[PDB]
Amino acid sequence: AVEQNLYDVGPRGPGHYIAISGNTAAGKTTLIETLAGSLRAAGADAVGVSERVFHHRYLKLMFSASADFAFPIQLSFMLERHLLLLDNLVRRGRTMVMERSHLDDAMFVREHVASGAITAAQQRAYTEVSGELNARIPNPDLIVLMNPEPELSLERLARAEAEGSRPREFPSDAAKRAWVHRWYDLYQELHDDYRRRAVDGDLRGTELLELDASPEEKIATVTARARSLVV
Amino acid sequence: AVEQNLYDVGPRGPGHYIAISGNTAAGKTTLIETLAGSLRAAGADAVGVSERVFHHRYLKLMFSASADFAFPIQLSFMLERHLLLLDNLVRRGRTMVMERSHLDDAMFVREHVASGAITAAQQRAYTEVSGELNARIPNPDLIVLMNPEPELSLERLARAEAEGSRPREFPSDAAKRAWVHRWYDLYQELHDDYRRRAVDGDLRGTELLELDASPEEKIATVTARARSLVV
Ligand SMILES: Nc1ccn([C@@H]2S[C@@](O)(CO)[C@@H](O)[C@H]2O)c(=O)n1
Numbered sequence A, B: 001a002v003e004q005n006l007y008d009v010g011p012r013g014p015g016h017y018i019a020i021s022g023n024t025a026a027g028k029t030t031l032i033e034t035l036a037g038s039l040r041a042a043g044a045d046a047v048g049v050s051e052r053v054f055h056h057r058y059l060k061l062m063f064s065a066s067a068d069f070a071f072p073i074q075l076s077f078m079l080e081r082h083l084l085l086l087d088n089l090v091r092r093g094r095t096m097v098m099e100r101s102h103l104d105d106a107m108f109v110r111e112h113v114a115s116g117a118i119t120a121a122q123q124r125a126y127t128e129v130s131g132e133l134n135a136r137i138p139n140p141d142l143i144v145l146m147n148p149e150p151e152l153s154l155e156r157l158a159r160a161e162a163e164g165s166r167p168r169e170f171p172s173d174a175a176k177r178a179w180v181h182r183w184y185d186l187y188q189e190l191h192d193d194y195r196r197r198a199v200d201g202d203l204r205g206t207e208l209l210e211l212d213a214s215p216e217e218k219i220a221t222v223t224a225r226a227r228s229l230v231v
């Protein structure tokens, strides 16, 4: 994040905002970094921001001590993503390729409300702050719907945990599988919502990209649409 | 903070919570570290937490770009202090000597509301989240009222900035002096409030310590009262 100059408070409209949307529980770091690189090649000051940037040091406690930590850790995801966008995209006019946009955090609170880890009153408070924060951030310019199947997410996650490339964030194998499945199910509904909101809701000025196709064809399609934005 | 093991998510009622309250714009790091050391000497797992632990990387923008950054940076102070207390004090039962408690953050939002940097609607949202967060954190056990005069805060700050021991967080000398004076004035009112709330409000189970006396006498008085808590 220091190499990407994400946290520079020095002097400098907004830049461009590209976001993946889907249950990327094992991450899309290669895709967002390759995409940001292609935008740099075209002349943009572009950075690919993986969710790991927003992992609070207390992240594991959201899953092992959910009734206590899910609310404040969800506030953290929203707040840190907000600040990073407000500084890099809005204030400094940079081009952001995000693993997840500010529109998708509320779904993760909904999951914890349904399990009882976040109370209805906590959710109402979250929604009031989220409304004020999101009103200051532009909608993404290009949203790419990419929701992999849970079995694939879980195979990738299991290999990464076994090889030590990321910590075991969940308190049991079953809890890992359950959270990943709950997020997948919620993302199927959110993606149906996206198709409506892009046509008849608040995203009419945003390009919504859905993918057909090999992984090479998918990267090529996303890159072509993102490059339409580079000035 | 790594030496103090502040961010350990491993396995383990709450511990003890001692807080200074006042316009410590130049910091009370020596006092809180000496006090935490005295509690360690008596056998407590005690740590002194200065406000620098909660300085967001974007802190300077609260003062140079207040209309955009004061709201989310104030959310950050509240949230990070909340999480640190929820983990260290509540979950892990450690003894926390805080430069500032969770009860004092709202005053800093009030300052930005009065200047127009935070809107009334943003403040209402902040208050709703703050109420939910604070309901999960015990009141401090010992609160020490220490509000130095602004001229002293500013002399200390000027020397620290000139010697490079901390960054210049403010966009002009006048803005630094103005914020420090506004915080001092608000803290005089908050300290009047504290004297009422300790007797007839929500702090009746807390020891409120006010200081007469040399700096040596002040440290000795605070240390004696904090040591009454070490088991
Ligand atoms: N608002 C959010 C955003 C992301 N995530 C998790 S945290 C993670 O990146 C760990 O690798 C992955 O599990 C995401 O699903 C969340 O719980 N809440």
Ligand SMILES: Nc1ccn([C@@H]2S[C@@](O)(CO)[C@@H](O)[C@H]2O)c(=O)n1
Pocket: B024, B025, B051, B052, B074, B077, B078, B104, B105, B106, B108, B109, B169, B183
């Ligand atoms: N909720 C809060 C808590 C602390 N502070 C400032 S940040 C500081 O520590 C910089 O050294 C000092 O200026 C404090 O007064 C704030 O602006 N808002």
